[PDB]
Amino acid sequence: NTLVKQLSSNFGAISSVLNDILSRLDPPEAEVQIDRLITGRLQSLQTYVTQQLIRAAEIRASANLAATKMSECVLGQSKRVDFCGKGYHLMSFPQSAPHGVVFLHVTYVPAQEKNFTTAPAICHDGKAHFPREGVFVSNGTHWFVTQRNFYEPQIITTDNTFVSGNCDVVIGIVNNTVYDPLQPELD
Amino acid sequence: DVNCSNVFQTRAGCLIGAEHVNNSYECDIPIGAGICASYQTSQSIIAYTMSLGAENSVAYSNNSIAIPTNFTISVTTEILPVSMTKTSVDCTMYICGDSTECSNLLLQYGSFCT
Amino acid sequence: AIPTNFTISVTTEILPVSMTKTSVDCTMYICGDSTECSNLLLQYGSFCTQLNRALTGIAVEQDKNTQEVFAQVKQIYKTPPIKDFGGFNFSQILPDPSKPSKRSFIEDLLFNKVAQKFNGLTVLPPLLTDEMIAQYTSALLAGTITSGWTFGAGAALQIPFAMQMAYRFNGIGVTQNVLYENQKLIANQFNSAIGKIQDSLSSALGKLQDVVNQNAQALNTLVKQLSSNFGAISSVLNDILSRLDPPEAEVQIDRLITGRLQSLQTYVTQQLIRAAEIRASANLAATKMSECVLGQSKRVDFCGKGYHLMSFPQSAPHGVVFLHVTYVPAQEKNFTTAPAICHDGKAHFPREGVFVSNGTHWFVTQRNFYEPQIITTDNTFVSGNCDVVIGIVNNTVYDPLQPELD
Numbered sequence: 001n002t003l004v005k006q007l008s009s010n011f012g013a014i015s016s017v018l019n020d021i022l023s024r025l026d027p028p029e030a031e032v033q034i035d036r037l038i039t040g041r042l043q044s045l046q047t048y049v050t051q052q053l054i055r056a057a058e059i060r061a062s063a064n065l066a067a068t069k070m071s072e073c074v075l076g077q078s079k080r081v082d083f084c085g086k087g088y089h090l091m092s093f094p095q096s097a098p099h100g101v102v103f104l105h106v107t108y109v110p111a112q113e114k115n116f117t118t119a120p121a122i123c124h125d126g127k128a129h130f131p132r133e134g135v136f137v138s139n140g141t142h143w144f145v146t147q148r149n150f151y152e153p154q155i156i157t158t159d160n161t162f163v164s165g166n167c168d169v170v171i172g173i174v175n176n177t178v179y180d181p182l183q184p185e186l187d
Numbered sequence: 188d189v190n191c192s193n194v195f196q197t198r199a200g201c202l203i204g205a206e207h208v209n210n211s212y213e214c215d216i217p218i219g220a221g222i223c224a225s226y227q228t229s230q231s232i233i234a235y236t237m238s239l240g241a242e243n244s245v246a247y248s249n250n251s252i253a254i255p256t257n258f259t260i261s262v263t264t265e266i267l268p269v270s271m272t273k274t275s276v277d278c279t280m281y282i283c284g285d286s287t288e289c290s291n292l293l294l295q296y297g298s299f300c301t
Numbered sequence: 302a303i304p305t306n307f308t309i310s311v312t313t314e315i316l317p318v319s320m321t322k323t324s325v326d327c328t329m330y331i332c333g334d335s336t337e338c339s340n341l342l343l344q345y346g347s348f349c350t351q352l353n354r355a356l357t358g359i360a361v362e363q364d365k366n367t368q369e370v371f372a373q374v375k376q377i378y379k380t381p382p383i384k385d386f387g388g389f390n391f392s393q394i395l396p397d398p399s400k401p402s403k404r405s406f407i408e409d410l411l412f413n414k415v416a417q418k419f420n421g422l423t424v425l426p427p428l429l430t431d432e433m434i435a436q437y438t439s440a441l442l443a444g445t446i447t448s449g450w451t452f453g454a455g456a457a458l459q460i461p462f463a464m465q466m467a468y469r470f471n472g473i474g475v476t477q478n479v480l481y482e483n484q485k486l487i488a489n490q491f492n493s494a495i496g497k498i499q500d501s502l503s504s505a506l507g508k509l510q511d512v513v514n515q516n517a518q519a520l521n522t523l524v525k526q527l528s529s530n531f532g533a534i535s536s537v538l539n540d541i542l543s544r545l546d547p548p549e550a551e552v553q554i555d556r557l558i559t560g561r562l563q564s565l566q567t568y569v570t571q572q573l574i575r576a577a578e579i580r581a582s583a584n585l586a587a588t589k590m591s592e593c594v595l596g597q598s599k600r601v602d603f604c605g606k607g608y609h610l611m612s613f614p615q616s617a618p619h620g621v622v623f624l625h626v627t628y629v630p631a632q633e634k635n636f637t638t639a640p641a642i643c644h645d646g647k648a649h650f651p652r653e654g655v656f657v658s659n660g661t662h663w664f665v666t667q668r669n670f671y672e673p674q675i676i677t678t679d680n681t682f683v684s685g686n687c688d689v690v691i692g693i694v695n696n697t698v699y700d701p702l703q704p705e706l707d
Binding site for chain 3: 188198199217219220221239240241242243244245246247248249250251252253254255
Binding site: 003007018019022027030031034035038041042045046048049055059062063065066069085086087097099100101102103104105106107108109110111112113114115116117118119135137146149150151172 | 251257264288
């Protein structure tokens with residue numbers, strides 16, 4: 001609609017019609033009137049194309065950004081933090097849209113939580129025990145073992161705890177016995 | 188940029204028609220200098236300071252860790268453009284019409300329209 | 302070569318998220334305390350109408366970039382009252398209450414380094430002040446030393462820093478038991494790395510200064526154009542009308558209006574190009590906020606230089622300062638390795654480590670640290686015979702299942 005208004009503007013002349021200049025004015029003296037009309041429109045065309053090149057860069061930047069999310073969030077699982085939506089992304093569902101695309105991410109965000117006591121290490125017979133990938137928790141006096149996501153207490157055995165020296169090197173290490181399933185198997 | 192009932196003089200401007208209160212609410216209409224305006228409580232246009240969020244703190248401990256017990260499933264929606272419309276502009280039709288001398292002067296600027 | 306020692310190094314990175322705002326109007330620039338100037342400006346009103354909609358379209362994007370980098374959560378977290386963070390002393394990144402502003406000592410050190418409106422060069426004031434930006438940076442540093450990565454994806458989960466530091470160190474392949482055996486060594490190297498950055502920033506922020514210089518340089522260009530004649534004899538509109546009548550001065554006023562429209566189209570073109578660089582840099586800075594600060598990103602040459610463990614975002618005028626914690630090994634030796642070890646006709650392949658030797662005995666350790674461990678059957682597994690492997694040595698396995706039966 002902006003280019004339509006340029007055809008009606010006189011640009012300092014007496015009329016914006018090309019046929020009107022060659023009717024009321026002689027051709028030998030009409031060269032100074034048509035030149036101002038053409039020059040006034042060339043500045044509008046150069047500005048129009050300049051704006052289209054800038055808007056094309058924003059669309060190109062959005063197309064390259066959406067292409068990475070199409071080959072990672074949809075095709076495969078992206079382990080990045082806050083990339084495929086907002087939370088632990090699992091799978092995506094791309095949907096079509098006029099002059100665009102709509103993404104449907106399925107995140108995994110926990111809900112409520114509780115509070116339990118922990119310990120950096122557990123000392124048994126002078127050997128420091130460390131978890132493999134879990135975290136030592138405790139409800140009452142009992143010391144259990146769970147993962148770092150869902151609350152699933154288990155029994156602290158020898159398969160989840162490994163020795164790594166003595167107990168006089170860990171600052172703030174507690175003292176608690178460790179159940180050994182190998183002993184009842186030999187009895 | 189005017190030096191200054193319900194007159195409020197801030198670092199961004201001068202608003203006449205909104206009473207400033209000591210309470211802080213959520214932002215809505217941005218004005219400047221971290222001051223927003225909204226239609227809240229009779230109810231009229233009042234001025235206040237925008238709220239940056241609910242101030243809270245986490246009790247730091249040395250022998251306690253929070254373990255989540257319940258998990259939920261949330262689905263989000265994002266909008267990203269892909270393409271737009273395509274147009275075309277020609278010098279022989281937009282600049283000149285059904286004339287003859289108009290196309291003669293355009294030949295001198297043929298490199299621009301090309 | 303298996304590394305035996307580890308060091309802690311902190312790198313810096315200056316990236317700009319925003320700039321200065323400036324609004325230009327055709328009224329206080331092209332026209333004057335004159336009367337005929339406005340009449341001619343109505344024929345070229347379509348050019349100035351786009352200026353009032355293109356310059357304002359940049360100011361709405363500068364405030365939007367600030368809501369994507371510094372605005373990540375909806376809760377304002379504060380620092381805990383206990384200053385004991387597991388042996389690590391935090392005071393350089395925490396806001397000092399004795400200071401008049403809510404900024405730390407590092408944020409206050411970089412702040413010291415970082416007539417025109419009468420001609421139609423109005424400056425729009427920013428929305429977010431310098432006090433509200435420091436509040437968002439304090440909430441990110443509070444959740445990092447406490448939670449770390451659980452506050453940005455749900456509720457805040459409290460966890461001591463002694464056990465949280467071991468989780469950040471296991472993201473490279475090293476076990477967690479090594480951190481507890483050298484807890485005093487990491488605390489001495491972490492505090493020494495902060496002193497090197499503090500002394501370096503007290504005696505160069507060129508990424509945030511060149512942007513301001515380019516803004517003021519383009520403003521002086523429009524000032525020089527108003528004093529020119531553009532083919533006439535004067536520049537003030539109140540001087541030409543006082544000596545020439547409007548019926549005869551129309552050949553000079555049109556040249557001044559046209560000669561100023563070229564500078565407006567050139568100035569608005571450079572602002573749109575510089576806005577694309579700030580918008581592109583804002584998307585890259587917002588990505589590192591959710592990758593380096595939020596979570597442990599294993600990307601190479603992305604969160605500093607080397608193995609990344611944690612980050613600490615800071616504040617900066619028209620920018621953002623990051624403090625990554627890199628990991629680089631040092632002091633390595635030479636040991637003899639072997640692809641596999643044959644026992645009673647079975648090739649034992651490792652699971653996560655590699656066999657090492659010192660010329661006499663044969664040990665086994667991981668891929669990132671030298672830990673002298675005996676050859677066990679629980680750390681390896683059999684797979685076929687020994688005549689299908691090109692390179693394999695022969696050594697007796699201790700077999701931990703033998704002493705258990707005695």
